[PDB]
C-alpha cells in the first residue's frame, strides 16, 4: 500500500496473509486474500499460477504483521487451490484473475471467527457502487514502488472507483480493462495498492454492509498518474465462486 495508514487486523478481520514454503524451508510472502467463509479464502490466480501446488502454501488469519506472530492468529494448510480455468495474461492485464483456497489446519479445522478473524460479505450479482465511491484496500504490499522490502505492519488506504468508460480511455488502460475488472485510484494518484497487495480486498459499503467488491489484480507501477489499480470485479464471478465453494 502506497500512502494510506498503518492498521491492524481488527480493522480488516477477513484479511488473509498467504505465504509460500521453499525449497529448503524458507517461507516468503506471496499475496493477500479474503475470508469469505470459515473454510474458504478468495485471492488472485496470478499469485499461484507459476507454482500451483497447494502443498507449497501457508495461510494465516488474524495476522497484523508480516514476519512476526500476532496474538490470536490461526495458521492453515491449503486443502485445495482452485485457479480460474479461463485465466490469461499479457504484458499487463490478467483476465479472470480469481482463485479460491480451501483452508484446513493441521488439526483439520477451518477458521474460528473472533475479534481478529471474520468473514467478508460477497456482493449481490452485477451490483457495484457508483463511480467516485470511496473504497478501502488492505495489504502487506510495498510502501513505495522502488522498495525492496515489504512493510512489517499491515496497511490500508482509500481509493475511489473509476468508471469503465474513464478507465478504458487510451491514456488510462485502453482495451486492457474489461467489464470483469474495476479500476480504482486516488484523485491525486498519491495512494494505491502495490506489489504484494495482489489477491487482497477492495472493500466497499454497499446497501449498508462492508462488501468484497474487488480483488487486487494488476496495474502499471503504483500510485502513478493515469494508471489506476485494477481489481477483479467480484460481482461478475458469483456463479464461479458458488460452484467452486
Amino acid at each position: 500500500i502506497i500512502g494510506g495508514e498503518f492498521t491492524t487486523i481488527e480493522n480488516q478481520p477477513w484479511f488473509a496473509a498467504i505465504y509460500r514454503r521453499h525449497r529448503g524451508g524458507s517461507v516468503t510472502y506471496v499475496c493477500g486474500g479474503s475470508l469469505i467463509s470459515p473454510c474458504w479464502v478468495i485471492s488472485a490466480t496470478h499469485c499461484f499460477i507459476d507454482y500451483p501446488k497447494k502443498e507449497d502454501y501457508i495461510v494465516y488469519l488474524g495476522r497484523s504483521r508480516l514476519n512476526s506472530n500476532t496474538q490470536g492468529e490461526m495458521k492453515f494448510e491449503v486443502e485445495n487451490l482452485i485457479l480460474h480455468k479461463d485465466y490469461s495474461a499479457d504484458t499487463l492485464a490478467h483476465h479472470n484473475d480469481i482463485a479460491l483456497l480451501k483452508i484446513r489446519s493441521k488439526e483439520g479445522r477451518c477458521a474460528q471467527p473472533s475479534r481478529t478473524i471474520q468473514t467478508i460479505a460477497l456482493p449481490s450479482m452485477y451490483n457495484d457502487p457508483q463511480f467516485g465511491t470511496s473504497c478501502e484496500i488492505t495489504g502487506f504490499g510495498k510502501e513505495q514502488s522502488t522498495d525492496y522490502l515489504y512493510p512489517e505492519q499491515l496497511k490500508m488506504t482509500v481509493v475511489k472507483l473509476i468508471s469503465h468508460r474513464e478507465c478504458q480511455q487510451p491514456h488510462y488502460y485502453g482495451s486492457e480493462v474489461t467489464t470483469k475488472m474495476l479500476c480504482a485510484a486516488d484523485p491525486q494518484w498519491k495512494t494505491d495498492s502495490c506489489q504484494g497487495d495482489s489477491g487482497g480486498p477492495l472493500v466497499c459499503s454497499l446497501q449498508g454492509r462492508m462488501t468484497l467488491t474487488g480483488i487486487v489484480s494488476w496495474g502499471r507501477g503504483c500510485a502513478l498518474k493515469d494508471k489506476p489499480g485494477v481489481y477483479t470485479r467480484v460481482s461478475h464471478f458469483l456463479p464461479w465462486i458458488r460452484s467452486h465453494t
Binding site: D50, A89, G219
Partner: peptide, 14 residues
Amino acid sequence: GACSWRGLENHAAC
C-alpha cells in the same frame, strides 16, 4: 520493471 508490479508476484521469471 514489470516484476515490481501487481500481477507478477511469485513468478519464476522475477
